[PDB]
Amino acid sequence: SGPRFCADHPFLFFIRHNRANSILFCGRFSSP
Amino acid sequence: LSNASGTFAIRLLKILCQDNPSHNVFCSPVSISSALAMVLLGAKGNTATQMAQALSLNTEEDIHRAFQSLLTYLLRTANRLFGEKTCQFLSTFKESCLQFYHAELKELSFIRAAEESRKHINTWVSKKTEGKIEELLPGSSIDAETRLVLVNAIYFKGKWNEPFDETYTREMPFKINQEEQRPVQMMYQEATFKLAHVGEVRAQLLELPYARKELSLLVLLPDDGVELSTVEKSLTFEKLTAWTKPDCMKSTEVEVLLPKFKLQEDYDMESVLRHLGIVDAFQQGKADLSAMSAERDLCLSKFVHKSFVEVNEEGTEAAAASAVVIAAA
Numbered sequence A: 001s002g003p004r005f006c007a008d009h010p011f012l013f014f015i016r017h018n019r020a021n022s023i024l025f026c027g028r029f030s031s032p
Numbered sequence B: 001l002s003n004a005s006g007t008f009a010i011r012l013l014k015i016l017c018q019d020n021p022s023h024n025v026f027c028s029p030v031s032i033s034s035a036l037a038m039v040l041l042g043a044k045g046n047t048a049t050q051m052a053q054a055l056s057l058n059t060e061e062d063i064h065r066a067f068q069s070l071l072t073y074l075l076r077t078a079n080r081l082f083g084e085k086t087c088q089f090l091s092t093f094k095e096s097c098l099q100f101y102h103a104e105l106k107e108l109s110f111i112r113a114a115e116e117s118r119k120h121i122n123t124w125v126s127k128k129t130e131g132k133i134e135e136l137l138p139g140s141s142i143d144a145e146t147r148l149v150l151v152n153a154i155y156f157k158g159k160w161n162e163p164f165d166e167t168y169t170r171e172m173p174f175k176i177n178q179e180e181q182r183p184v185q186m187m188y189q190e191a192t193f194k195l196a197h198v199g200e201v202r203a204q205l206l207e208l209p210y211a212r213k214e215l216s217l218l219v220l221l222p223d224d225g226v227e228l229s230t231v232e233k234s235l236t237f238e239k240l241t242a243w244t245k246p247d248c249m250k251s252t253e254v255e256v257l258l259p260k261f262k263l264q265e266d267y268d269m270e271s272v273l274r275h276l277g278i279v280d281a282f283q284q285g286k287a288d289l290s291a292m293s294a295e296r297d298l299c300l301s302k303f304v305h306k307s308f309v310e311v312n313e314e315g316t317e318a319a320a321a322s323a324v325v326i327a328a329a
């Protein structure tokens, strides 16, 4: 019922430096 | 400025996603832009203008501010230049790479010992990436015409602010497309995280902070019937920034299922940089790298990027390196 984040299909992702708002790494997870 | 480098990162990601359909993608925009910026410091004319605009630096002012701004868990970056020992490079160029990127120039014999030189650079990158990026430069990327190699390496390792308990990791199906599913080890935890529902593109955006909350992992997950390619096409750095603001991405108790995974990717970047408009630097006769050397038949012969990431219950480890080969044409 409550909020659910189920990453069982392709997604984008980002490693960010928060203070700087800087994307240090980014990618797509498409398949194991 | 922050908008410049974010625009570059998102454009990079969109091009790589589009050029590698149905394939995992991982890159470091910071690493690629550091390597490209060192080239920019040695370029002139239209060669330089194309590189600046690829980096979303559209005025002389924007270029100077970007470089001057450089002057002010583990996270570490390293830059180095590797130069043919029988050549001289302009003092102003070496000074700028030292000041802005802390890059020194190590001399190598590309002309007589190309393979030992390649091995030396690749060993340097391995050290700076804790062994995660081996053989950055592939065979034949260094040869008798090589004169200068500009290299960036980056390494990150961080623990989650709220780690997952491995007890609750279980194998589950991952839908790689509508008709195929493959097993993944899916981590599980219910905790309070910042989370946005993005109506415009029908996706959710989760933030998982690392310890100290200086860095975060952001995960953009399409709703269950939405093709990721539609989210990729809609994505811009301005939209992504809006979606992370407190009004969109608010603290929420949420059940998170996230796969454990490890990716290793490598890229020839020439087609990417061409899509961003960099053409002259690659072209004999048109390349103007005369701010690096008084020799003036230099061109950009190869640009490679290699990356590594591991996400698991304790945290994340990521590394990347970028090398630019400048050669005598």
Ligand SMILES: [Zn+2]
Pocket (backbone or CB within 6 Å): A006, A007, A008
């Ligand atoms: Zn699910």
Ligand SMILES: [Zn+2]
Pocket (backbone or CB within 6 Å): A006, A007, A008, A009, B175, B224
């Ligand atoms: Zn799903």
Ligand SMILES: [Zn+2]
Pocket (backbone or CB within 6 Å): A017, A018, A019, A020, B214
């Ligand atoms: Zn910070």
Ligand SMILES: [Zn+2]
Pocket (backbone or CB within 6 Å): B019, B271, B275
């Ligand atoms: Zn393309």
Ligand SMILES: [Zn+2]
Pocket (backbone or CB within 6 Å): B024, B263, B264, B265
């Ligand atoms: Zn892969």
Ligand SMILES: [Zn+2]
Pocket (backbone or CB within 6 Å): B059, B061, B062
């Ligand atoms: Zn400006």
Ligand SMILES: [Zn+2]
Pocket (backbone or CB within 6 Å): B060, B064
């Ligand atoms: Zn200037």
Ligand SMILES: [Zn+2]
Pocket (backbone or CB within 6 Å): B085, B107
């Ligand atoms: Zn010397």
Ligand SMILES: [Zn+2]
Pocket (backbone or CB within 6 Å): B084, B086, B087, B088, B295
């Ligand atoms: Zn020379």
Ligand SMILES: [Zn+2]
Pocket (backbone or CB within 6 Å): B071, B099, B100, B102
């Ligand atoms: Zn410094």
Ligand SMILES: [Zn+2]
Pocket (backbone or CB within 6 Å): B102, B103, B104
């Ligand atoms: Zn240094």
Ligand SMILES: [Zn+2]
Pocket (backbone or CB within 6 Å): B130
């Ligand atoms: Zn070490």
Ligand SMILES: [Zn+2]
Pocket (backbone or CB within 6 Å): B197, B202, B203, B223
């Ligand atoms: Zn939705």
Ligand SMILES: [Zn+2]
Pocket (backbone or CB within 6 Å): B196, B197, B198, B199, B243, B247, B248, B249
């Ligand atoms: Zn919103």
Ligand SMILES: [Zn+2]
Pocket (backbone or CB within 6 Å): B242, B243, B245, B247, B248
């Ligand atoms: Zn909003």
Ligand SMILES: [Zn+2]
Pocket (backbone or CB within 6 Å): B253
């Ligand atoms: Zn509660």
